[PDB]
Design a protein around this ligand. Structure first.
Ligand SMILES: CCCCCCCC/C=C\CCCCCCCC(=O)O[C@@H](COC(=O)CCCCCCCCCCCCCCC)COP(=O)([O-])OCC[N+](C)(C)C
Ligand SMILES: CCCCCCCC/C=C\CCCCCCCC(=O)O[C@@H](COC(=O)CCCCCCCCCCCCCCC)COP(=O)([O-])OCC[N+](C)(C)C
Ligand SMILES: CC(C)CCC[C@@H](C)[C@H]1CC[C@H]2[C@@H]3CC=C4C[C@@H](O)CC[C@]4(C)[C@H]3CC[C@]12C
Ligand SMILES: CC(C)CCC[C@@H](C)[C@H]1CC[C@H]2[C@@H]3CC=C4C[C@@H](O)CC[C@]4(C)[C@H]3CC[C@]12C
Ligand SMILES: CC(C)CCC[C@@H](C)[C@H]1CC[C@H]2[C@@H]3CC=C4C[C@@H](O)CC[C@]4(C)[C@H]3CC[C@]12C
Ligand SMILES: CC(C)CCC[C@@H](C)[C@H]1CC[C@H]2[C@@H]3CC=C4C[C@@H](O)CC[C@]4(C)[C@H]3CC[C@]12C
Ligand SMILES: CC(C)CCC[C@@H](C)[C@H]1CC[C@H]2[C@@H]3CC=C4C[C@@H](O)CC[C@]4(C)[C@H]3CC[C@]12C
Ligand SMILES: CC(C)CCC[C@@H](C)[C@H]1CC[C@H]2[C@@H]3CC=C4C[C@@H](O)CC[C@]4(C)[C@H]3CC[C@]12C
Ligand SMILES: CC(C)CCC[C@@H](C)[C@H]1CC[C@H]2[C@@H]3CC=C4C[C@@H](O)CC[C@]4(C)[C@H]3CC[C@]12C
Ligand SMILES: CC(C)CCC[C@@H](C)[C@H]1CC[C@H]2[C@@H]3CC=C4C[C@@H](O)CC[C@]4(C)[C@H]3CC[C@]12C
Ligand SMILES: CC(=O)N[C@@H]1[C@@H](O)[C@H](O)[C@@H](CO)O[C@H]1O
Ligand SMILES: CC(=O)N[C@@H]1[C@@H](O)[C@H](O)[C@@H](CO)O[C@H]1O
Ligand SMILES: [Zn+2]
Ligand SMILES: [Zn+2]
Lengths: 660, 660
RNA sequence: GGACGGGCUGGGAUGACAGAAGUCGCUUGG
RNA sequence: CCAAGCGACUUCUGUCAUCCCAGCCCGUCC
RNA sequence: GGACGGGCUGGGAUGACAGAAGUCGCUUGG
RNA sequence: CCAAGCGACUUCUGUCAUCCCAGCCCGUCC
């Protein structure tokens, strides 16, 4: 004997059953003629009677497959964290037309005939006979090499393709040949079977870590169940110019869920594909409409404060103004920008989670709408700062001025715009979320303003303590999000803070029946109702509780201040009533749009990727964009109301001003 | 013909030369008898006359190698960023004794004889004859499987092993068999050829990305030239219990340097190995000696301030004290801890850079000495805070009290301890270094104290502006470190700050000849000398310039204050003179030990790993640990001096106190 | 008579690593 | 017509590890 | 007479994908 | 003695792509 056995297999052979005698090697050869051009070939190996090898450790059977141009290795059994399968298969890069010689037309029978070989080798380390099974199946060039676009055709669609642990799928994309500068791919599935979407440059391998020391990350691995999205940017298309796309089913649903119990590692999944060619877009109409909508609100500032300004030691305040309050947002922005710029193109589709049903790209930014919709905060914060500085300028009549604290509120509105724009570059699970804590700070600052407005000029050191508390609460909620008692910690902290506020009110104002008793009663009832609401509903997500509580407390205290003004035989101007009504309406709308967020970092990446909320307006504005815009509007209206409410006391002597 | 040719090769054959005819496959078989147990086999393939294939793209020759237990693929030519080699080789996992049957003794000739096969397959997609070369070499079980320790033997050493792109090296480590709970490996090389150190669990592969979707990081890839260190912790040894270690030469020195011009991708490198078994250590003697040394300094506080305390609206100050100054350090610490805990064992040896010649481990911490040597800052900051609060307590005689600013100084000493301890968990190239900015803040706060001590009580809003400036400078230096004009930006900012300080002095004190003119002259000369020093020396590293400038300016201003006290016919107590002399000496020693840092993130990872500074004292304290300890001592002495210098004016009326 | 553990003793076939003798191929420049 | 690096086996000394095993003896359970 | 580009026309060998007919192996529970 | 999922080819309709090519003609450079 020779220990090496050579077998000639036909092209019609799809299933091969053979017995590997001890210490023997099987070589199987299939001749590939010209009909195998651009045919994606899959080879799978299975061990017959795997129960006889349960006491054996390591690889029991080795299979090598090669067609001359590409190759791979099959090692059985394959070990995954949950299970061990005695079957596995891989894909082979198809042969091209250049592999069969130069014209292939007019075979006048003159130069030699050239063929290609598919070679399969089977080996084992066991000193015993093993029965194995081989599956040799192909995908033709009608389904592989499917991405060919006609003139005027920018979208192609596939539908309902079976997929299994034994039947992977693959596509070839040639951007240079098809004149594609931007490409987007979407996958749709109605069942919840875990699968993987793989994208690689056409000159790279998905199986071989081609060099010992690579550390290059050009391979995309996106686990998905219902939806997956990949976006090829101009930079990536210029860098690589050609790509291969693969979809593989995962043997176990452990990277996609926690409990589905599918029961048989080989199931079928139906997937529909969407291939679209994109071009650079300047969203002129939606941006112009958004700016127009954000502009006419400011017609309330013009007739009063700007007209007053027209009719009309600083160094000891600049050096003592707290400038360290801007630091956390700036460090977070720097860290996020560094993480974004040092990441590769492939990693940006894996580490970031956008609502791709309402994401409009711009260059490398996946969701330009979620970034540009933050301009209202910047505009209103700049207006607040400039107005407060200009409106400065007396000490006997009227309510105490609040210039520095209004400047702080404007500064934090600008910081909110910056932080929310930074967050939407790449939303992920990080130590500091920083999507809406500046709104909490703004609400607290408004509460502080109305608290101290009738005793003195409010100071921005309350900003220091408030910011420390807000950042600590954000970090604590982020760190305990995976546990089951985070909401109880939130409730305990909430109760402590509310009790401290009520005690401070009781000490500052005194125990009069009408003023402090009803304040404490209403505040405690409202906060207890909120705590009951977010403890036993499961409809309130973790990232919304703090913002909702801060907004509710700010609104309640503002309403209390207005009621106290009315009850003390004072007059609220109809302009202030209009500003308050607009603030209430805007806050209600912003909260309604904020509730539709549905963000949860405790679930799997596939569960996150399965979000399918489409745009609401002009194919550009979603629920989150409207939340940004209406939150900015609500902040503006609240600022105008607090600036304008005490206008009836402008001539009243400071000694005769009621305190509450 | 059959297109498949089977060749029987002998064990003596080390070099095989053959011609691959067009559309033919070569199968080469070598029988492996029992003598091949634990023999590490290397197979390399070379294309003869590679100049004939310069117009061909993709893989020209495919080689598969397998011994039944392990396999790999060779695809030629291999493409690296700088060059294309038409030769490559890989390593094969050796066969074990279980692969040849059960006793192998007393062959009474009664059951079958079992052998193993080494199979090599050669294929090509070209329609032309190719000449190729095969190298089959082995490493015996005397060098592979070298890590076997006798009784009482904790260290083994290898020396001067040749290594090439064609002769990789490898070792097997069995922690369970050898009773190893902690393991450390060091590599020494005298030449600067780039190489790679690979560590993998014994059931994993270094070549195959075993599952489509892995994302597991258990493979260590450390590029090195002169030195490399890997540390196996108890957690890793428990998780995996067996490891394989490999060293490969890189074809191009592009991941190790920028300009060496070696000229021939195949050169030899001499490497010496060091294998040591470690046990958990409690460094009782060095820690006790350090604490004793840090304790007796505090005998200066006892006779005066504590004796005074023994002889002896707050809410309006707690709510206005700037608490946002603690935020940047706390967020940096949280981010670093999250990055540390979510990292795998293998990644911690790649992403972190310690001075391994002076790193003492404790659990998973690689350099426990660099962390525990920060306790002096914590102790002295707590002492400063407690002393300042207790010493409070009148308004007509003496210098204005500075309780809140001393509390701030103590708080920032504690923050410095926290930030420096956090930095030494994993020193890397990040957006915010945060190793010594709190020292800069402390120096600035001392300057502010001595600036405002004779006009009013210093306020901690100067802390806000100072911290914003320090953090901005740190980030700016970090972001422009790779350029060639960062020091010019530093010099421009330095000049601006010095000019602003001089102008503020001129405005505050007035243009008298003796006081302000010489102050401006000396300050400008000193800062210009410093700027000239760090602009044209290259001995001052980027991460030291800001700290050195802040320390120098603080010392200069303190000396100026003392000289002004002496010149104004005042008396400095001998105790204050002793405190000042000790502060100067401690600052000099701390600066001397700080200069020996030699940290530069602009160089390659191998250049960073080639640092070999050993411990100076007790095998535990290096230059950096002494820098920590003496910086804490210098801060303590400076604080005592500023607290005690104006003791001669305790009874002097505040109206008769000179201002300077 | 089973036994592989027992030192010892010597032989054997080697295998691979470090330090020392003359033969190929790939590189350039004049 | 020069000088390198690498590669292979003609063969010299430490070595480090394999097994084929040579014998009697101390030797306990068969 | 070279020419592969030219539609058309029909045949051929198919190959692979989606939707419809009865055959193996692996899973359990009673 | 039950019910699933998968796998293979007996064969039915859209299809999608390959080449073997069948002919004359419009046809320009040989
Ligand atoms: C570790 C984890 C984080 C922990 C913290 C987490 C929360 C961090 C948030 C906030 C922390 C800071 C809040 C204030 C602290 C108490 C101060 C106080 O009551 O006294 C002050 C009152 O001043 C006010 O009460 C002003 C309004 C406060 C707005 C902020 C609270 C928002 C409520 C959010 C709703 C619940 C939060 C949402 C929960 C999901 C001043 O006292 P005084 O005596 O009047 O002044 C003395 C001078 N005088 C007497 C002469 C006038
Ligand atoms: C964007 C990138 C970062 C940019 C910033 C980077 C640096 C950030 C660092 C620092 C920024 C902050 C420094 C102070 C700012 C000027 C204030 C001033 O002069 O006036 C104050 C003086 O008070 C002092 O001068 C106190 C001492 C200052 C200590 C800090 C400087 C350290 C020098 C570091 C050496 C160079 C740094 C190292 C370079 C490698 C007060 O003014 P006044 O008029 O007296 O008060 C009015 C009231 N009165 C008149 C009634 C009394
Ligand atoms: C200042 C107020 C109005 C908000 C700022 C809006 C302006 C400055 C923004 C909004 C939309 C933006 C544009 C959106 C799309 C394009 C097309 C592309 O070439 C990138 C830049 C460019 C040209 C942007 C330039 C800046 C832009 C015009
Ligand atoms: C502020 C109120 C009063 C007016 C509203 C401003 C609107 C109409 C303006 C302001 C800035 C403008 C943008 C400025 C520049 C660009 C880039 C150009 O390539 C396409 C149009 C586009 C994107 C404009 C769209 C319209 C735009 C958003
Ligand atoms: C959140 C902020 C902006 C809203 C402030 C709106 C102000 C103007 C509104 C909200 C609550 C209102 C009060 C609610 C209830 C009553 C009781 C009744 O006797 C009529 C007047 C009075 C006393 C209202 C006066 C106007 C009022 C104070
Ligand atoms: C003054 C604001 C900020 C505080 C209270 C916010 C109010 C307006 C918000 C917060 C909770 C919201 C509700 C939450 C749940 C539901 C059920 C579902 O059909 C969506 C809308 C609806 C009916 C929302 C309507 C608007 C809502 C009541
Ligand atoms: C408070 C002052 C004295 C500084 C604090 C020093 C003390 C608390 C530190 C310094 C050295 C430390 C020890 C160093 C080593 C060991 C051995 C091991 O089992 C881990 C914990 C343990 C036991 C540490 C416990 C804490 C420790 C004793
Ligand atoms: C503070 C001055 C006055 C005294 C110096 C304190 C020294 C001697 C003390 C303080 C805390 C002590 C440590 C406390 C606990 C442990 C853990 C134990 O498993 C080994 C000893 C060790 C590591 C001690 C070493 C000595 C130590 C560092
Ligand atoms: C950095 C801090 C802690 C050091 C302060 C040390 C003090 C005590 C020292 C440092 C510089 C010294 C001065 C340096 C020069 C002179 C000039 C001469 O006429 C003697 C006294 C006098 C005026 C010294 C007095 C003491 C002095 C002020
Ligand atoms: C008062 C302090 C903080 C400011 C000045 C620091 C002094 C003491 C430091 C900073 C620069 C240092 C010098 C820098 C360079 C050299 C050359 C070499 O042989 C090492 C030591 C030596 C000779 C150092 C001695 C100490 C040194 C002069
Ligand atoms: C696939 C496609 O339609 N691409 C067209 C191609 O026909 C044309 O030759 C070229 C220049 O117009 O690129 C474009
Ligand atoms: C390699 C080594 O010395 N390990 C020793 C081994 O001899 C002993 O049997 C066991 C328990 O003491 O572990 C230890
Ligand atoms: Zn947002
Ligand atoms: Zn340090």
């Amino acid at each position: 004997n020779s220990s090496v056995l050579v077998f000639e297999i036909s092209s019609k052979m799809k299933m091969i059953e053979k017995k590997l005698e001890a210490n023997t090697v099987h070589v199987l050869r299939l001749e590939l003629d010209q009909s195998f051009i651009l045919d994606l070939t899959k080879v799978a190996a299975e061990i017959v009677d795997s129960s006889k090898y349960s006491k054996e450790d390591g690889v029991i059977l080795e299979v090598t497959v090669s067609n001359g141009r590409d190759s791979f290795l099959l090692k059985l059994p394959t070990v995954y964290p949950n299970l061990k399968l005695y079957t596995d298969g891989k894909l082979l890069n198809p042969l091209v037309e250049q592999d069969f010689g130069a014209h292939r037309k007019r075979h006048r029978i003159g130069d030699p005939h050239f063929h290609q070989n598919l070679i399969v080798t089977v080996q084992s380390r066991l000193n015993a006979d093993i029965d194995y099974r081989l599956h040799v199946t192909h995908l033709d060039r009608a389904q592989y090499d499917f991405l060919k676009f006609k003139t005027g055709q920018t979208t192609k669609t596939l539908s309902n393709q079976k997929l299994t642990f034994v039947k992977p799928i693959g596509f070839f994309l040639n951007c240079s040949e098809q004149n594609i500068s931007q490409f987007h791919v979407t996958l749709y599935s109605e069942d919840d079977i875990c699968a993987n979407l793989i994208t690689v440059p056409a000159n790279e391998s998905i199986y071989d870590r081609s060099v010992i020391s690579d550390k290059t990350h050009n391979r995309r691995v996106l686990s998905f169940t219902k939806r997956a999205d990949i976006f090829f940017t101009e930079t990536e298309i210029s860098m690589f110019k050609s790509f291969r796309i693969f979809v593989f089913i995962a043997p176990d649903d452990s990277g996609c869920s926690t409990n589905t119990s599918r029961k048989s590692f080989n199931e079928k999944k139906k997937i529909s594909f969407e291939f679209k060619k994109l071009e650079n877009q300047s969203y002129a109409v939606p941006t112009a409409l958004m700016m127009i909508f954000l502009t006419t609100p400011c017609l309330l500032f013009l007739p009063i404060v700007i007209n007053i300004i027209k009719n009309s030691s600083l160094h000891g305040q600049m050096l003592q103004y707290p400038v360290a309050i801007i630091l956390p947002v700036l460090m977070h922005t720097a860290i996020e920008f560094h993480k974004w710029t040092t990441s590769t193109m492939a990693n940006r589709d894996e580490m970031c989670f956008h609502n791709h049903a309402c994401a409009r790209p711009l260059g490398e930014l996946r969701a330009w709408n979620n970034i540009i919709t933050n301009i209202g905060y910047t505009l209103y914060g700049a207006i607040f700062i400039v107005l407060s500085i200009c409106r400065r300028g007396s000490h006997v009549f009227g309510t105490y001025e609040c210039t520095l604290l209004d400047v702080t509120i404007g500064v934090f509105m600008v910081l909110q715009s910056i932080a929310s724009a930074t967050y939407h570059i790449c939303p992920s699970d990080v130590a500091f979320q920083f999507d809406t804590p500046c709104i909490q700070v703004i609400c607290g600052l408004l509460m502080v303003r109305q608290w101290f407005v009738r005793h003195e000029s409010p100071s921005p050191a309350y900003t220091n303590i408030l910011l420390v508390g807000v950042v600590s609460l954000n970090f604590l909620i982020s760190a305990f999000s995976k546990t089951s008692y985070v909401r109880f910690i939130i409730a305990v902290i909430h109760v402590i803070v509310v009790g401290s506020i009520c005690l401070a009110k009781e000490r500052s104002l005194g125990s009069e029946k009408l003023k402090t008793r009803f304040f404490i009663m209403a505040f405690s009832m409202g906060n207890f109702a909120a705590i009951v609401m977010y403890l036993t509903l499961s409809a309130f997500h973790l990232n919304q509780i703090a913002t909702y509580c801060f907004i509710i407390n700010c609104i309640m205290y503002l309403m209390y201040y207005g009621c106290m003004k009315v009850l003390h035989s004072e007059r609220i101007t109809s302009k202030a009533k209009l500003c308050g009504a607009l603030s209430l309406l805007a806050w209600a709308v912003a909260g309604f749009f904020f509730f539709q967020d549905d963000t949860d970092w405790t679930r799997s990446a596939a569960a996150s990727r399965a979000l399918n909320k489409p745009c609401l307006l002009l194919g550009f504005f979603g629920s989150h964009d409207l939340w940004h815009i209406f939150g900015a509007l609500a902040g503006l209206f609240t600022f105008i109301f607090v600036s304008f409410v005490d206008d009836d006391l402008i001539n009243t002597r400071k000694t005769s001003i009621n305190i509450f």
